[model samples]
Target chain A: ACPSQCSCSGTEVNCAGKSLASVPAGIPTTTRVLYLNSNQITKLEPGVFDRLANLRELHLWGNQLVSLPPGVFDNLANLEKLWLNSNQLTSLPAGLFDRLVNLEHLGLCCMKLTELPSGAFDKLTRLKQLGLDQNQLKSIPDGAFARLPSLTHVWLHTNPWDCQCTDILYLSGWVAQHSSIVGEGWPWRHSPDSAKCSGTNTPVRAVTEASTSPSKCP
Target chain B: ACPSQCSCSGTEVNCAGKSLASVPAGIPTTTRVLYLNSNQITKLEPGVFDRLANLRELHLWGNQLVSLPPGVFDNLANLEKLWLNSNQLTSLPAGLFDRLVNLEHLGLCCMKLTELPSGAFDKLTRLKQLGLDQNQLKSIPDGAFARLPSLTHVWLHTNPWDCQCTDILYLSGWVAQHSSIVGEGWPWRHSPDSAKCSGTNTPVRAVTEASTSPSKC
Candidate 1:
């Protein structure tokens, strides 16, 4: 039987908009679509999802989760779409995404991710679309997109990208190659002011090719 | 005893945001403040609020009442503030305001009223302010403000005022005399485009003194 507060089909479970602080049990192991979005779920107890190996679409958006526990989703290798946006996640636990190998659409927008977890996204080899907008990221890892060969498009906007070529600005080979796949949902880039650099009012898309370090944040 | 759903103290009753379709009974006659706003209340049966003789502030805003019953407010003569905004009232009863003798602050904004009830407001001899903005009124009765001598300010934005020396525009003696209190909350008049007349796109305040009935609408 399903939990008293939740509704369930034979293969799908809906626990949305409830005052849930932790995952409710009694969900069938064969559940394919699990909706846990828009809840007060602040806990992602590890191995709680280990039984739902057949889960295909996991919606964890609009929750109050501050951070993920490593391997919380390790068993759901068949997960195709994961929505972890609209949470207060300040950082990701290492290997958070190494388990969702079959993930294609990842919603990481509307969170406070100041930096990306190294080698976590590289495991999403089959990922096609990634949304990382509306974050507080100042720079991307050098090989951020190098390993995601199957990524067709990346949505990035409203992030404070540094302009002075201090560290990752002239990752020219990475940008010049990935520029074609970027700017699809990039409305911020259209108005240069919307995508300006952190200290200087320089547009992120208009970063000059000159590889010279300038002033320390004006 | 107070009703089960409503919260009540010695002098106040609050039944806001409930699934009420009718007025809950058992409100004390000595209650002074009653809040019935933001409900699905569709019924305002006559004499339901009659027992509350000492009621001072009655908030009936944000209900779904399409038309009000006459004598609904006849007994609440002690009511000082009544909030009837955010409802779907297309028409008001004939004598709705006749018994609200002490009402000082009346909120009638954000409703679908197309016309004002005649001679009803004349009895509110002590009313100080009225809010009739965001309604569908095209004309007010001839002696609308003639009796509201205590009315210091009236908010009339977002109404369809017909231009061209129409019925109430050149109640000029009334407008010229009451123009000071007219535009206090009249932001729509600042932008002539906002207070434009119904068919001609003319500013309501800019109605010329040379009275000439030229146009049809």
Candidate 2:
């Protein structure tokens, strides 16, 4: 006598290590954390999370999700952590996190993301931990992560940083003045000699060179 | 110019990490150890190792080889080690190791072998270490490993053992009498409680109290 849009008993539904084509029905209404790791899941049907309003953490790693529709988390007001790592995702929708105001940790590492649309995290003011490492990202656009005032920790390592572009200049100004957390566990640290540039073939100064610049990115 | 039958680099031939369909060509006469690991090799064509009469070791792991063409290693009189792990092999040809009298180690773990062919290792008197872990084996056939008098260490963990059968009784007696290495680093140690049949409708011993004969199995 399980309810719709939910699975078996308990607040945590672990359908891992099983051969399931699609998610099981009747997910627990009180579930806060749903672990569907290491499965062959390929899609997250619409309204899958409609009843999971109280869900905070969702693990969809090691699946085959290629894309997600917009407003997927529109009803999850209390969602804090979203793990979408180890998937085949190539892009994310614009303003993906506009509804998740209470989101504190966002894990999108080890994906195929090459670029992030502008104003991506505009509504996520309370975001603290952002994992953007291990993607095909070439550079971070200017003012890309500038609106996140409360963002303290950011994981942007394993991304190609362009030294010749104006994006680094803006980020340098932000890092110097903001002193916010950035890429603590990133394999590639932002350094003067390490930052690679495209044309002109000039080496960009280490982050230490412009570490003193406060608000000169503009 | 590369030879027609082998890929030789004077003394060392490196066929590692390649998509080679078979053993490479142009191998020099002075080659010692051949590295054919991580390839798509599915078969060792006849006379594949005939040129390597002086070879010492052959690494053919991580491939899709299902069977050998018999006496594949007869040319390697000095060969001592054979690594055949991580493949789709299910069985080996009998007398496969009859020519390798000096062989010491054979790694055949992580395959689909459920049973060993008869008289496979009867001639390998100098063999010391054998690896047979991570297979679909449910029971060890009688007298299967009795030929290996010099076998000192064997890795047999991670296999489906018959918890409610009499084969466990003979296996237990064989291991106890010869001190043969059965389960090293195994989760289920050789305990009296482990000898009891598990996963049965009712509790039963691998050796019942009425069946006192050791050779009954």
Candidate 3:
């Protein structure tokens, strides 16, 4: 059930027509890039990729999954590239990537994720590019990626980033600090700049939320 | 050069191309129809069509032609059908068809001709069908088609035939003699008696020019 429109060939695997309810069962242990996109598979069975430590790229976009259990990617610790742009998950499971330290380019745009837990990205210190655009996100969880000292780029646009909330006000401040991580390819980079925030057309002021503010807000 | 868009199947034709500077040469003496329509032809040289004595149907519609020489069709004594609708012609050459005793159907609709000359259609004794609709004609020569014994169907509906003049008033009297010709397939055939003439919107009688007295008119 790899993305139907892709052209991928590897040494020991030919996942041509696998009606993968979950990941294909015949995946070669040596398969380097596993394409399991465009499948109706909901939840990725845990430990699905733990044995395939040599897999470099994992494509799981165009699926029906709404959310993930914690540690969903703990088995893909060796994966470097992951594409999950077109999916239905509205809120990310906290610590979802606590163990995928080797992931470099992560695509999470066009997912319906509305909120990121304050420490959702607490452990990924090696990610060079993180795309979080085109989601249902109303705001970034405070310090969602504050724990990643090595995070060089983080894309957080195209979500319904509520310009009205005080907690989300910190988004502007976060961008002030590390605006380099997010890539602005289309559907991600395109939002009206002059859009009014809340009822006021003014730019949002940062970090004004009360003490009840979730620590994850950016 | 021959008119480009005209489909020519016969050996000779008077298809004087739209840009004709004057009458083009090589028209066959056997050519019996001349379609000088839809062109830049603005005027005719006297006797331009004199050579085509065999011409019976002459379609000079859709041109910028303003008037014709009275002798124009006099050369084609055998000419019968004549179509001169849709031109800028404001008047007809009196006695224009004096020699075409064999002429029958005459189509003169959609010309800007506002009037006809007395006896303009007098010489066509054998003429039968006449079409004068869709013109700006406010009046026809009194008894315009009166002299032709064979003349029957006369379409005066779409013109300013509504002018309701002493002459058009004659149609009321003339219909008794010509009903067989005017009754067939005309829009007014089975029309309710009150629908006598439908397309005429304004009564030309209310205008200052409606009187019949030469001075009052």
* Better model by TM-score: candidate 1 vs candidate 2: 1
Model 1: residues with Cα > 4 Å off, grouped in runs: A1-218, B170-173, B184-195, B209-217
Worst 10 residues of 2 chain B by lDDT: B186-195
The CAPRI quality class of candidate 2 comes to incorrect
Estimate the Cα RMSD of every predicted model relative to the unseen true structure.
Answer: 25.5, 16.7, 31.6
TM-score of each: 0.47, 0.44, 0.42
Give the Cα error of residue B147 in candidate 3, in Å.
99
- Please state the Cα-based DockQ of model 1 relative to the true two-chain complex: 0.01
For A1-218, candidate 2 gives per-residue lDDT tens digits of 23343232234445553556566777777877777666777877777788889888887787888887777788888998888888878888886778898997788988888778778888888886677777877556678777676675566555565544445675555545544244334211222232233333343334433432334332
Candidate 1 residue pairs in backbone clash? none
lDDT tens readout by residue for model 1, B7-126: 653355678877888889899888888888889888788888878889899989999888888988888889999999889988788888999999987889899999887786889888
User: Candidate 3 chain A vs. true chain A: TM-score?
Assistant: 0.76
Among these predictions, the greatest TM-score belongs to 1
Write down the TM-score for model 2. 0.44
